Amino acid sequence: SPGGVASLLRLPRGCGEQTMIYLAPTLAASRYLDKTEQWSTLPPETKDHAVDLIQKGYMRIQQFRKADGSYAAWLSRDSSTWLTAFVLKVLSLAQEQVGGSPEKLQETSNWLLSQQQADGSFQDPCPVLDRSMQGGLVGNDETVALTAFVTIALHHGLAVFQDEGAEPLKQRVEASISKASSFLGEKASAGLLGAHAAAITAYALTLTKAPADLRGVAHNNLMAMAQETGDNLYWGQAPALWIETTAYALLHLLLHEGKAEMADQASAWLTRQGSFQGGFRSTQDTVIALDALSAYWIASHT
């Protein structure tokens, strides 16, 4: 949807929290047009504008980076585990084109590992002020949603680790992703998780190649909640929560099976949600939905 997506290309501004609210979707929109090959249908300078925006956000967000590589709305404010993980995931991807000292990111990953518990979960000592940017995470399954979110972030960070110099860290990050996936796998099995917790967990396990048995239980636990009401598949006009939850389920399926019935049934439901006047309605649902649909495209245009 060319122009509609390019509309998400915005200028970052404000504190550390507001900057990501603009950067995250800007980077997501750009990546969507970069993968679907729809740049040509837009003015040739648009890409130079998009690229220039992503770069400005990268620099600006670094002004909110602490010595230990953690982030918060302000330097004087205590760091948020969620925000730090969110920044890591975005910047890791932004590396795709903008270049950035991989050491900065390796350090941020080290900080995250100190936030992990003995049971494998993650805690956020000082949550972000604008809780609406966190999406479906805010709720009764916050600990699970946070642990899954942070795991995904660490995975993306690994892809930007220097060759050889940081072998020890890499392993400590893989060991961390293992305990968390263990914790997540146990929670998914119990069956007490909500729709959003189920979706993000499934994707987290699949994306990080968790033990088959674990990934299998998370998948089944998810499908059981699927909502095939019409020739539309979805989880949860539609509230942001459902869009975010369904987009996570899609990234899972595309990595769990590929491009089957459910992949298309769900990819058509959120396509109609993002087509409405104004597109998606918030940080998380917008970002994850665009990542899902762009990943789906490639799967359908091989």
Residue 71 phi, psi (nearest 5): -130, 155
User: Resolution in angstroms for this experimental structure?
Assistant: 2.3
CA distance linking residue 37 with residue 168, whole number of Å: 39
Q: Token pair of 149, please?
A: 């979110």
Could you tell me the residue ranges of all domains in the chain? 1-302
Q: What top-level class would CATH report for the domain 1-302? A: mainly alpha
CA distance linking residue 159 with residue 226, whole number of Å: 32
In this structure, which amino acid lies at residue 165? Answer: G
| Residue indicated by tokens 């917790």 | 197
| Residue indicated by tokens 């893989």 | 174
Residue 54: strand, helix, or coil? helix
Residue 122 phi, psi (nearest 5): -120, 150
CA distance linking residue 269 with residue 32, whole number of Å: 18
Greatest Cα pair distance, the chain, in angstroms, is 53
Strand pairing report for 233-234 and 227-228? antiparallel
Instruction: Count the residues in the chain.
Output: 302
CA distance linking residue 4 with residue 40, whole number of Å: 15
Residue of 275, 284, 278 whose CA lies nearest to 246: 284
Sign of CA dihedral 125, 127, 128, 134: positive
Give the end-to-end CA distance of the chain in Å, rounded to a whole number.
20
| Residue indicated by tokens 């946070």 | 146
Which residues are within 8 A (CB) of 212 and not within 5 positions of it... i.e. 6 or more apart? none
Residue 164 phi, psi (nearest 5): 85, -50
> 252 with 219: CB under 8 angstroms?
yes
Residue 297's H or E segment, with its range, is helix 283-300
PDB experimental method: X-ray
CA distance linking residue 284 with residue 246, whole number of Å: 12
Q: Token pair of 238, please?
A: 């539609």
Q: Token pair of 25, please?
A: 């979707």
Q: How far is residue 259 from each of residues 35, 146, 295, 299, measured CA to CA in Å?
A: 17, 28, 11, 7
Residue 177 phi, psi (nearest 5): -70, -25
Other C-beta atoms lying within 10 Å of the C-beta of residue 301: 9
In this structure, which amino acid lies at residue 94? Answer: A
CA distance linking residue 99 with residue 58, whole number of Å: 10
In this structure, which amino acid lies at residue 263? Answer: A
**Per-state percent for the chain, helix, strand, coil, to nearest 5:** 65, 5, 35
Other C-beta atoms lying within 10 Å of the C-beta of residue 41: 12
Which residues are within 8 A (CB) of 100 and not within 5 positions of it... i.e. 6 or more apart? 58, 91, 94
Sign of CA dihedral 178, 101, 200, 263: negative
Which residues are within 8 A (CB) of 294 and not within 5 positions of it... i.e. 6 or more apart? 31, 32, 35, 36
Strand partners, 234: 227
